[PDB]
Amino acid sequence: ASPSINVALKAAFPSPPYLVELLETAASDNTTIYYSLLDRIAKGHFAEATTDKALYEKFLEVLRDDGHMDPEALSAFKLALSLRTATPRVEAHYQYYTATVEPSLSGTQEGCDQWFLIDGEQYCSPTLDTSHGKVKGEDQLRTLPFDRKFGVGSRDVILYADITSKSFAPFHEVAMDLAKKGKASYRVRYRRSPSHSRESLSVNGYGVELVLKRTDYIVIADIKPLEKSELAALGMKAASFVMQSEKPFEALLKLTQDFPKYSNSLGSQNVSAEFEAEHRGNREVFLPEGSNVLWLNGLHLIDRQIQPFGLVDLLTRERKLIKSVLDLGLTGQQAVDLLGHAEVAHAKSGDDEPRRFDWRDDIEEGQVIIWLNNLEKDKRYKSFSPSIWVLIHHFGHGLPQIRRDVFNLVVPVDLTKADDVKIVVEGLLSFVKRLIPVRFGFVPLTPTGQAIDQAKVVYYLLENYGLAAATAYLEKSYEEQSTGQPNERIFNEVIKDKSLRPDGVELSFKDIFISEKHEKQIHLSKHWVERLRAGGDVPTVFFDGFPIPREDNWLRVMNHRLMQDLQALQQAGYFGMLNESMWLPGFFLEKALSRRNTLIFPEDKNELTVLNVNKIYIENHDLMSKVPVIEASKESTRDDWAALTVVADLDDIEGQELVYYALRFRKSNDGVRLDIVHNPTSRSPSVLAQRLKSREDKLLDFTRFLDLETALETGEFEPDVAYDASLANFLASSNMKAGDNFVILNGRVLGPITSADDFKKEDFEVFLQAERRTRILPVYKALEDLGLDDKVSGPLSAAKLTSVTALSTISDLPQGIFDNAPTVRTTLFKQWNSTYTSFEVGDASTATIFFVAVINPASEIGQRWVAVLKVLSELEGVHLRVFLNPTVMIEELPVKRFYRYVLSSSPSFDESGKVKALSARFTGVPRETLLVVGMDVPPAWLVTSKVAVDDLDNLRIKDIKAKRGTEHVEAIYELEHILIEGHSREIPGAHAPRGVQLVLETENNPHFADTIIMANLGYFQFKANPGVYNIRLKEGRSSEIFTLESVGAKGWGPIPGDDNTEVVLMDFQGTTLYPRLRRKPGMEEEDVLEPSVSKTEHAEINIFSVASGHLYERMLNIMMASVMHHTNHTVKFWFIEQFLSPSFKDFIPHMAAEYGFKYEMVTYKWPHWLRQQKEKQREIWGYKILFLDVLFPLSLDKVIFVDADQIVRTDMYDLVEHPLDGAPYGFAPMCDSRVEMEGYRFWKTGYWANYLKGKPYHISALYVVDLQRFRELAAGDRLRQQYHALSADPNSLANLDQDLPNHMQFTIPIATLPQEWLWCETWCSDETLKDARTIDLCNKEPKLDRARRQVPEWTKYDEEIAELARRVREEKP
């Protein structure tokens, strides 16, 4: 009965048959479920179900009966089935089939409804008698994302089937059995079924908004009553309403959906019921008022992840993780509590911190570093204060003088090499003389004979005679002899004078081979260099335990850290952490490691691989119950416990050397539990494994290495070929090759080990020390704090937990892209009092999923959150807890829209049994309020209106009732495109390649789409639908400079096996890519700078525009016509697709036939990083200026913008031919001609006249863009980053479209146009219009009035459109 508004969304592809959709949804990624169901339907089991409901009903019984799903999984199936998540996955098959299969399958197809493809041969019969062809085109045997494989087989078989018919069943069975035998491996691909109709797909999982477009007024329903002017209490009173209701869940939804309507209905409470001013004790501790925050098992989610699709994928990943944990007897509640524990999160923060290594002599008994300083005892610094407050009371870029030990620099130097020696002599000494507060040390490098001797020489000379004498030899040697061989002619001269009083123990003189001096000193030195990997082709310098390789300007790097370390000391001083009796260098050495291994501590910080340990001992039980195992000792403690597994090639020296070290390490550490895996031209071998398991008891009784070597040779054994099988499966699961050495401690993998000298006994010790710290100790404390320490029964038992919690903290989203914040699971909201602001839904005891929502009722973002969370709360095995936190800071109206979310937790069915389409229905809509319809769609989606007879930008029920006779409005949108978006990087010095051009292709067409790489995050996007695509760099400069190794389809990575350029989209989340591009031979080149096409493709003239109303669209029709009458040339029109009405959209082919022009619809989705516009008018303006380079195809040389309200009397070519004098775009200035208008000319004021020193204030109603130059100058990137930067201030750009080119005319040239090109009554005189080319209707007479009065021929154009519209309406086929 009530006046209603109904909005529905339909996809750009027809609805796949329901049967196939249920198969796909049902078997998400478990193949066994897939084929086990494929058998069931090939029985003809699902033939007796006539309707979608019946068919859906049948699947529930089947899944439950065959043990496939439990309550939790069944419930998750229903929601995912509602969402229609599997439909794009099925359409991927069809697009692939339509575009690559059909054109590469030459012949005459008759009876070939289904057909196997074997060895590029097609067989239309199960009997497999004859082959129709050698299939043309690329190999189809490529295993791609939507594939499934059944069985292992030398031969590869593919069946393209239309499952719907009965014709399928015999073909399936032919290859199912063939796979069961082992002849070949089976996989199914789809064929668009002609039994089904070409009806479009109805989607859900989006939101609709009804935005009030007049917000200015404030001091069933008619209009919202505006209330004076105590906004401040809205959130607070709104929060109470709910609490009071007692069915609170439903209240919030009912209140939050129609919130603008209930504003004046909240002025009454009656007295606020503010018991909950109590819970700002909650605010005082953790979150600021009016902030929306969601947590999923501790995981802090960003806004983009809060949609139905984003949330379904998170549960799927999360349950897999938790189920892994609860096989150890932990409740979902206990499991989550452990994952988000304080001690756990602390560890992640701890090793987010930068790492230092212990540069000290202490291990080498103070006989390796030869310091040129001592700041506490040098009698140079004697003058200076040895006070801490000297450090703390410092400001500037200068170095504070002090007599204290605080900064150290150790540089390893080769005394054979002149360049190396020069560093010490010139570099190091100046610094000493200069009284710098840094201690300078250096350790010689010993790689050759001469080097060994010269270390001895210098070391000796220091020991007896002193630093000055040693320095003296070095100085003299460098200038005098200029070589790294010891020179006595030079050496003896030094002793002659410098041999005065050599103190301490006396000099022995020449020659040197001291049993102690040569042995201990040189070998101790070698032990220092080896320990910190401070040698080789490129040596490593250590400043405050921070490695800086000896390259480029390392001192510049050192100085940067020197200041950064000083500021680190000062802040500890202001908090009073520091005290007078302290060794200051040890502030840095607190967390420093003794040994530096590039495997444990890779320079790529991200490089980390962890495996699920439980999985390893579950999948390969056959293998791991027969490997030589050294159990960790009977009498050792939980803290000592750790599990190690060594994978090595025992047929190689490196492989068996590595194991000896692991065995040695085990003798020392009684807590470790060791496993040995033989990997293996010999195949397998179970023999070598059997040789060791016999010696298992006697393991680590190997006094010498040959005892291990000999044990491998002796004994006669019978190969356990069952062992061999599980062995090769393990490596395949763990993604590791044959003859490769690896080390696994508590799930963490290091390798491949090329040389066993890289991983020694000392390396295992630090590996355990570091790993222990981070992963094991935080798990142990946390675990015990909860009292779950009963569940740990040994080293292997413990590894399952530690390995799982390490996998929990690895992000889905790379840090720095969507949010800078790390993957830290907080438990910090557990402190909060809950009685009067919280309510829970779902069983906490059973729940695997725990949601914590902190929603502000006054927020528009809250409207969406509530709606989505209610549907996810309906799922079994999910728990939700809600916190309401309003703000007292309300300067403007809080919620200015009505909201509806289209989503169901389980599918709905027709009276006919068909699946119910889901719609957003607003009932009891105010009759007098002007409303705007908006779509709040998931990030990967591109949406436009398809069916509507109303103005969605200007909705009023009273007008529709008075014009149409109906109080009911119905509109349909189309999900036209789904995004392929990615973040590029250059290799190896990873930077965003800007100006790079890309081409998206398909086998049908080699030019689907094209875009250019942006500066910010190497961002790019493509508009596509489900299917198989490829990304080729655009032929030209781009392919000349670069080669793209990969499209990052597997993740940020590189994940092995991703050296691919193929993209496929089979999800409603689109495709997220992280491509990599490496520069071709010796290039520092740039695309942007040099070393009739567009006309032919498009038109002589290319004009683009935008309109946001029926009036503005009516005026746009006139604009196009005026051009046409005024030019005997070819014109193409370009439009911003999503701002136009379907009435306009359905009309243009008719305008195109009449006026003889071509048209193309264009759009681009506003990037996630780029700053949004809440106000639609502002969005529109942004579209005209921010995306000029990326909105139009590369093939377009140039474009012209003409405003909707405009009219043109000129042949528009002239604007093309207008010389731009190397400028990217051309504009027309503001009229000075009107005499008395001055007052309102704001661009002659302080701000605009100071800024525009001499430059004009231009008009955005008309302009030329020399697109080739625009992109070449990379103007867009600059516009975008200046806009983003300026936009932080809300009052920054009054009219951005005009203001951005004007603000950028210093930076980006603007060609100025003759003013013959623009006329506006408001600012130009009437005398001017005789020579006027075009007219804008700039802004109290209305726009319709100005047109008729200002231009006499406006009516002539309007009549032409009017009769044609009627001619079309009266044209019925």
Ligand SMILES: *[C@@H]1O[C@H](CO)[C@@H](O[C@@H]2O[C@H](CO)[C@@H](O[C@@H]3O[C@H](CO)[C@@H](O)[C@H](O[C@H]4O[C@H](CO[C@H]5O[C@H](CO)[C@@H](O)[C@H](O)[C@@H]5O)[C@@H](O)[C@H](O)[C@@H]4O)[C@@H]3O)[C@H](O)[C@H]2NC(C)=O)[C@H](O)[C@H]1NC(C)=O
């Ligand atoms: C893809 O999905 C399918 C379907 O959910 C998963 O495949 C199922 O895997 C089961 C084993 O993991 C298998 O059941 C086995 O049946 C034999 C014969 O009775 C048992 O010897 C096995 O024992 C192992 O698993 C049990 C599990 O507890 C069960 O105990 C009794 C057994 O009678 C059941 O009544 C009870 O409900 C429990 O489920 C352990 O207790 C044992 O120690 C032992 O390790 C298995 O029970 C299923 O037949 C198999 N297929 C189907 C259709 O269910 C598959 O794992 C999954 N794949 C992935 C990648 O997730």
Ligand SMILES: *[C@@H]1O[C@H](CO)[C@@H](O[C@@H]2O[C@H](CO)[C@@H](O)[C@H](O)[C@H]2NC(C)=O)[C@H](O)[C@H]1NC(C)=O
């Ligand atoms: C809120 O509600 C009503 C106002 O609507 C208050 O009650 C009124 O009390 C006066 C006497 O002080 C009576 O003359 C009115 O007739 C009452 N109104 C009604 C509708 O009964 C009430 O005191 C307010 N505050 C609280 C705590 O409820």
Ligand SMILES: *[C@@H]1O[C@H](CO)[C@@H](O[C@@H]2O[C@H](CO)[C@@H](O)[C@H](O)[C@H]2NC(C)=O)[C@H](O)[C@H]1NC(C)=O
């Ligand atoms: C949660 O609420 C309790 C009250 O139920 C708070 O307890 C207070 O504790 C202090 C001592 O630490 C007492 O002197 C107060 O009287 C208590 N408050 C009340 C209202 O009685 C507790 O501090 C609150 N915690 C948080 C995090 O808000």
Ligand SMILES: *[C@@H]1O[C@H](CO)[C@@H](O[C@@H]2O[C@H](CO)[C@@H](O)[C@H](O)[C@H]2NC(C)=O)[C@H](O)[C@H]1NC(C)=O
């Ligand atoms: C555009 O259209 C036509 C050419 O097809 C030109 O029209 C002719 O103009 C002369 C002089 O004004 C008339 O006497 C003829 O009768 C016209 N012929 C036709 C077929 O229209 C017109 O001048 C051209 N204008 C421009 C600007 O190119």
Ligand SMILES: *[C@@H]1O[C@H](CO)[C@@H](O)[C@H](O)[C@H]1NC(C)=O
């Ligand atoms: C204070 O000085 C002592 C030595 O006297 C030192 O061990 C301690 O670490 C210093 N205090 C702090 C808080 O670090």
Ligand SMILES: [Ca+2]
């Ligand atoms: Ca205008």
